[PDB]
Structure formats: structure tokens, C-alpha cells
Amino acid sequence: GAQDIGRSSVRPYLEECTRRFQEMFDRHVVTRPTKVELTDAELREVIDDCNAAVAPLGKTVSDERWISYVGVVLWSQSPRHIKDMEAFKAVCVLNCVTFVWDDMDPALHDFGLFLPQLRKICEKYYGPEDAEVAYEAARAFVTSDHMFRDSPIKAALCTTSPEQYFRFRVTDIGVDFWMKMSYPIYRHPEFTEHAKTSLAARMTTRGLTIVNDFYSYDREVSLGQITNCFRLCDVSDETAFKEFFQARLDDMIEDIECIKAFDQLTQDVFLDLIYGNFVWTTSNKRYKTAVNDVNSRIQA
Amino acid sequence: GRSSVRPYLEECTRRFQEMFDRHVVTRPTKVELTDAELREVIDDCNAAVAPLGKTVSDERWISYVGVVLWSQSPRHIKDMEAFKAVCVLNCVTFVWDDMDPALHDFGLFLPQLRKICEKYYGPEDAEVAYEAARAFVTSDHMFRDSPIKAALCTTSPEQYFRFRVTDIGVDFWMKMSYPIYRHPEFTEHAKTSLAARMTTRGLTIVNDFYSYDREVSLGQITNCFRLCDVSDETAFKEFFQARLDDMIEDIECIKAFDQLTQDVFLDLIYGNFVWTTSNKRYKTAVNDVNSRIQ
Numbered sequence: 001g002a003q004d005i006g007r008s009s010v011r012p013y014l015e016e017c018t019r020r021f022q023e024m025f026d027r028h029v030v031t032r033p034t035k036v037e038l039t040d041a042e043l044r045e046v047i048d049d050c051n052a053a054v055a056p057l058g059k060t061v062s063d064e065r066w067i068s069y070v071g072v073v074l075w076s077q078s079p080r081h082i083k084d085m086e087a088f089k090a091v092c093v094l095n096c097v098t099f100v101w102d103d104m105d106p107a108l109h110d111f112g113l114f115l116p117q118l119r120k121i122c123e124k125y126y127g128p129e130d131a132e133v134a135y136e137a138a139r140a141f142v143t144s145d146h147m148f149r150d151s152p153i154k155a156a157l158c159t160t161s162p163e164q165y166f167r168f169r170v171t172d173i174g175v176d177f178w179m180k181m182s183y184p185i186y187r188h189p190e191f192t193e194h195a196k197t198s199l200a201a202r203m204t205t206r207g208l209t210i211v212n213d214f215y216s217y218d219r220e221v222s223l224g225q226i227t228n229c230f231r232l233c234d235v236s237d238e239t240a241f242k243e244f245f246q247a248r249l250d251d252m253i254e255d256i257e258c259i260k261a262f263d264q265l266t267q268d269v270f271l272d273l274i275y276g277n278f279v280w281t282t283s284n285k286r287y288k289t290a291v292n293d294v295n296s297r298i299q300a
Numbered sequence: 301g302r303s304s305v306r307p308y309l310e311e312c313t314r315r316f317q318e319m320f321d322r323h324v325v326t327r328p329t330k331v332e333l334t335d336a337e338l339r340e341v342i343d344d345c346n347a348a349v350a351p352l353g354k355t356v357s358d359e360r361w362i363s364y365v366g367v368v369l370w371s372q373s374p375r376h377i378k379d380m381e382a383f384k385a386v387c388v389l390n391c392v393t394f395v396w397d398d399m400d401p402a403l404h405d406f407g408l409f410l411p412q413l414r415k416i417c418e419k420y421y422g423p424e425d426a427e428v429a430y431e432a433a434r435a436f437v438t439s440d441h442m443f444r445d446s447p448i449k450a451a452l453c454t455t456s457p458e459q460y461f462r463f464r465v466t467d468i469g470v471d472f473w474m475k476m477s478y479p480i481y482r483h484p485e486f487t488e489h490a491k492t493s494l495a496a497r498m499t500t501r502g503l504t505i506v507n508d509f510y511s512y513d514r515e516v517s518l519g520q521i522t523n524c525f526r527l528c529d530v531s532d533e534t535a536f537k538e539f540f541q542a543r544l545d546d547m548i549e550d551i552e553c554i555k556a557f558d559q560l561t562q563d564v565f566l567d568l569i570y571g572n573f574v575w576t577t578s579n580k581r582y583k584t585a586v587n588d589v590n591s592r593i594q
């Protein structure tokens with residue numbers, strides 16, 4: 001009793017959109033992101049921290065799956081500006097364990113067991129004041145992801161318009177959290193302020209989200225997840241899809257041009273985040289098959 | 301030509317109100333602070349800005365405080381100490397907003413904010429309120445002709461409203477106001493800033509319309525009506541209708557939140573309109589209560 005297969009996939013458009021994304025970055029960012037190459041002992045300080053954090057929750061996560069989560073941090077920070085490798089490791093761990101939370105059936109969502117682990121992490125890696133800002137944002141993200149599961153507010157914000165949708169994603173895609181745990185990496189006063197006002201997150205939300213949405217569309221509709229801007233257009237209609245996609249390209253371009261008004265080091269961090277997320281997204285098994293050993297729901 | 305939106309004052313006021321009556325319906329209710337409450341607030345404001353060395357009159361404090369009196373959600377208030385705190389913090393950062401930036405001494409003012417926050421709030425909420433107040437005044441200061449403010453207020457309504465989530469003080473407002481209500485959902489939306497992101501356009505479009513003449517006279521660029529041609533009534537009308545449509549869109553989406561939270565959001569937007577149209581600050585450009593503080 002067939003449903004709407006023609007709306008089930010953006011796979012027809014995969015090559016052309018990938019090409020167009022890359023052309024856009026080449027014309028407006030130019031500088032290619034840089035990957036951090038951790039060592040193995042060093043990677044096992046991150047991963048055993050990740051396993052320790054989610055271990056109380058009772059679900060095993062493979063090293064392969066951790067790898068899929070951690071790549072976004074390796075590719076989308078600004079390695080040239082790092083001064084707190086402890087803060088960098090915190091962001092690797094915090095990113096990864098909240099990625100697990102994102103992928104979990106909400107039955108496993110135990111704040112009483114998981115929150116204490118998040119405080120544990122922020123304390124090993126951050127000075128006591130930055131540990132406070134990182135913990136607040138991690139708490140706020142995991143609480144948001146959880147209460148908004150099948151939520152009326154999410155329904156309305158994901159159906160009305162792109163600008164309502166992106167307003168939801170400032171928090172839900174995790175970028176506000178990202179900024180508020182990453183500023184200790186850089187010890188840059190201006191970026192720290194843009195991080196704490198959330199202006200940093202507001203400038204980078206669309207560039208992160210549009211890319212994530214395109215490449216996670218197939219998995220998300222097969223699972224009934226509504227948080228994806230391409231559900232706002234008719235992806236079965238090539239003409240309509242193209243107009244929508246160009247509108248989203250225009251969004252990214254305008255944000256990138258305004259990020260250029262920020263000071264030199266802040267804009268490097270912002271642009272490495274957006275462009276690094278795109279390199280990571282296109283290179284990661286997470287977004288290559290619909291359902292896999294690193295991206296299928298962790299069900300309970 | 302582009303100097304003024306005076307010609308459209310009556311029509312735009314009419315249209316704002318019609319929009320609220322059809323979409324919000326329920327009218328703001330003013331808080332009637334008692335005397336002991338009101339005198340405490342003003343004395344507190346004067347103590348806070350005294351280290352900056354400038355006089356603020358009672359009628360200037362009253363004009364600032366009216367937004368809190370009109371734009372909270374009285375029938376849901378639980379903690380009047382938190383309400384008094386929002387009165388004081390709102391007012392003293394309004395003074396900061398009106399201060400030409402040589403006066404901004406963080407080492408003298410930040411301790412004042414900290415002590416206000418600790419007096420009226422518990423230990424956890426005092427930290428959230430203080431960080432939000434600190435972020436606001438720092439942002440107002442660091443963006444006085446910054447290039448970032450340049451790009452974000454010139455490019456599109458998009459970048460502009462993104463700047464105003466912080467710069468119009470609404471993120472700060474939410475983070476100091478959630479203790480008033482003790483409503484866990486509202487507290488989450490406040491701390492994620494989703495509450496601020498939902499209410500920014502409604503507050504800003506109204507504020508920008510009625511503060512345009514003052515801001516343009518005094519070389520101030522943070523105003524969405526500067527994005528469009530107020531020379532041409534037809535272009536102004538198109539732009540003003542696009543802004544009304546934005547407000548409507550936000551209000552209709554706000555009616556997805558839980559009943560109480562949506563009450564607070566909508567009383568904030570509608571109450572700001574009522575206060576703005578009754579406040580001398582938002583008539584003319586130079587007067588008793590909106591003059592730069594120098």
C-alpha cells in the first residue's frame with residue numbers, strides 16, 4: 001500500500017548538491033579546514049572517558065561508532081588556534097556522549113545517572129569556571145533533545161517556515177552547546193563573548209544544519225524524525241527541490257559573508273566549523289548508509 | 301526624506317493593535333507594585349548606578365520600569381522578589397544603554413549587578429541572572445560602532461534580528477524572569493534561549509518603529525526600518541507588512557508552547573507594545589527621559 005517513496009530520499013540529488021556545496025565553500029571560504037591527528041594513547045584517553053560516561057546507561061558503543069561521532073570535533077575546530085588540549089578533549093567526549101543521547105530511544109534517557117558523568121567530564125578538563133559554562137550547556141542540550149521528542153513545539157517549528165526551523169536548531173543541532181564548551185580551547189576574549197551571548201551559535205546554525213539535514217535526510221525520514229529542513233519542500237519535485245536548495249545556499253552565503261565582519265580569529269573558528277562539518281559529513285559512514293553499526297537507533 | 305516615520309505613526313499604531321487583537325486577544329495586565337515595593341526598586345536602582353557618577357530622575361526610572369510592569373504575566377507570578385529584581389536589573393541596564401560609552405566602567409558596575417542578583421534571587425538563579433546581565437552590558441559596550449554591528453544591521457532583516465536576540469536584552473530578560481514563575485518548562489526555554497528567539501521579532505519591530513526618529517537623529521544604526529526606504533510610502537508599506545507577517549508567524553508558533561509559557565511570551569510582546577505607545581521615551585527624539593547620558 002505504497003507511501004511516498006518519491007519523497008523518501010534526496011539520493012537522486014546527491015552528486016549535484018555535494019558539488020554545489022563545495023563550489024560555495026571554495027568561492028566564499030577558500031581556506032580548507034584542518035584535521036587534528038590525535039595519537040592512540042591520546043585517543044584512548046578520549047574514548048575510555050566516553051565509555052565511562054555512557055557506561056552507567058548500560059549500552060555498549062563500539063570504537064567504530066565513537067570514531068563516527070568524534071570526527072566532527074577533529075575536523076571542525078580550528079587547530080591552529082588551540083591552546084587548551086584539555087578543553088579540546090572535553091569537547092571530544094562531550095560531543096560524543098551527547099551524540100549517543102541523540103541516537104537513543106528516550107527510555108534510556110536517565111538524567112540522574114548521566115548528568116553526574118557530564119559534571120565529571122567538565123571538571124577533569126576545564127578550570128572550575130569554564131567547567132560551569134560547559135556543564136550548563138551540556139545539561140541544556142540533553143534536556144532539550146529529550147523533552148522535544150514527539151513534542152508539539154517541535155511539530156510547529158519544523159513545519160511552519162525555514163526561519164522557525166532554524167530557530168529550533170540553534171539549540172537542537174547542539175551548536176550553542178558546542179560554542180559554550182569550545183571557547184576554553186581558544187582563550188580568545190572576543191570569541192568567548194560571542195560564545196556566551198549565543199551570537200556565535202546563531203551565526204553558524206544554518207551552515208551546519210543545512211549540510212547536516214541534506215545528508216541525514218534519508219535516515220531521518222525512514223525513522224519518522226521531523227527535524228530536517230528539506231521536509232519543508234517537495235523533494236519528489238525536482239523544480240521545487242532546486243529552488244529550495246538554492247534558497248538554502250543563499251542562506252549559507254549570507255551568513256558566511258557576515259561572519260567575515262567578525263575579527264580575524266573568530267571568523268576562522270566560525271568558518272572552520274561550517275566547512276569542517278561539511279568535510280566530515282561527506283566522509284563519514286554516519287551519513288553514507290541509512291542504517292548501520294554507527295548510526296542506527298540505540299533502542300531499549 | 302528617510303529622516304522620519306512620523307507620517308505613518310497613526311496607521312502603524314492602528315495596524316499593530318489590530319494584529320494583537322486578532323492573534324493575541326488577551327490584553328496585557330499591569331502589575332501594581334505597592335509603595336514599599338516601588339521605593340525599594342528605585343532606591344536599589346540609584347545605589348546601582350551611583351558608582352558611575354550620574355543622576356537619574358524618578359520619572360526616568362519610571363519610564364524604564366514600565367516595560368516590566370506591563371510586559372510580565374501577573375496572574376502567573378509566584379515570586380515577587382524575582383519580579384523586583386527584574387525591575388531593578390531592567391532599569392539599570394537601560395541606563396547603560398542610554399550612556400555614551402566613555403561612562404561604562406565595568407569594575408564599578410559589575411559588582412552592583414552581582415549584589416542585586418544575590419539579594420533578590422536564590423544561589424543558583426543569582427548566577428544565571430548575573431551572567432545574563434553581564435553578557436548584555438558587555439555586548440552593548442563592545443558593539444558601539446563595532447564592524448560586526450555594521451554588517452548585521454545593514455545586510456538583511458535576517459542578520460539584524462539575530463543580533464537583536466542579545467542586543468534588545470530579551471535573552472537577558474528571559475534568564476532573569478524565569479524565577480518569577482517557577483515553571484520548569486519556561487525555565488528550560490529561557491536557558492536554551494528559545495524563549496528569547498521566539499519573542500525577539502515582536503519586541504524589536506515595535507521598539508524600532510517608535511524609536512526610529514530618536515535613533516536616526518543620533519547616528520544609531522540598530523533599527524530594522526533603516527533597511528528600507530521610508531521615503532516611499534509604498535516601499536515602507538511593503539516592508540511594514542513583511543514585519544507584521546513575521547510577528548504573526550512567531551505568535552502563531554508561540555501558541556504551540558504550553559499554556560502558561562505562551563502566556564508569558566505573548567504578554568511580553570503585547571505588553572511591550574502597550575508600554576511603548578504610552579511612554580514619552582518613544583515620542584519625539586529628544587526629551588525628558590531619552591536624552592543621551594553624558
Ligand SMILES: C=C(C)[C@@H]1CC[C@]2(C)C/C(F)=C(/C)CC/C=C(/C)CC[C@H]12
Nearest residue numbers: 094095098099102172173174175178208
Ligand atoms: C554536542 C554535540 C556537539 C551535539 C551532539 C548532538 C548534535 C545535535 C549532533 C549533530 F547535529 C551534529 C553532527 C552536527 C554537528 C554540529 C555541532 C556544533 C553540534 C552537534 C550536536
Ligand SMILES: C=C(C)[C@@H]1CC[C@]2(C)C/C(F)=C(/C)CC/C=C(/C)CC[C@H]12
Nearest residue numbers: 390393394397467468469470473503507
Ligand atoms: C527586553 C525587552 C522586553 C524590551 C524591549 C526593548 C527594550 C525597550 C530596549 C532596551 F532598553 C534593552 C536592551 C535594554 C534593557 C534590557 C531589557 C531587560 C528591557 C528593555 C526593552
Ligand SMILES: [Cl-]
Nearest residue numbers: 127128129130
Ligand atoms: Cl575556568
Ligand SMILES: [Cl-]
Nearest residue numbers: 170198465493
Ligand atoms: Cl540564541
Ligand SMILES: [Cl-]
Nearest residue numbers: 422423424425
Ligand atoms: Cl536558586
Ligand SMILES: [K+]
Nearest residue numbers: 247248250251
Ligand atoms: K535564503
Ligand SMILES: [K+]
Nearest residue numbers: 542543545546
Ligand atoms: K515578511
Ligand SMILES: [Mg+2]
Nearest residue numbers: 102145172173
Ligand atoms: Mg538530533
Ligand SMILES: [Mg+2]
Nearest residue numbers: 102103216225
Ligand atoms: Mg540525530
Ligand SMILES: [Mg+2]
Nearest residue numbers: 212213216220
Ligand atoms: Mg540530521
Ligand SMILES: [Mg+2]
Nearest residue numbers: 004006007236
Ligand atoms: Mg510527492
Ligand SMILES: [Mg+2]
Nearest residue numbers: 397440467468
Ligand atoms: Mg540598545
Ligand SMILES: [Mg+2]
Nearest residue numbers: 397398511520
Ligand atoms: Mg537604545
Ligand SMILES: [Mg+2]
Nearest residue numbers: 418421422423
Ligand atoms: Mg540570593
Ligand SMILES: [Mg+2]
Nearest residue numbers: 507508511515
Ligand atoms: Mg530602539
Ligand SMILES: [Mg+2]
Nearest residue numbers: 359580588589
Ligand atoms: Mg518628562
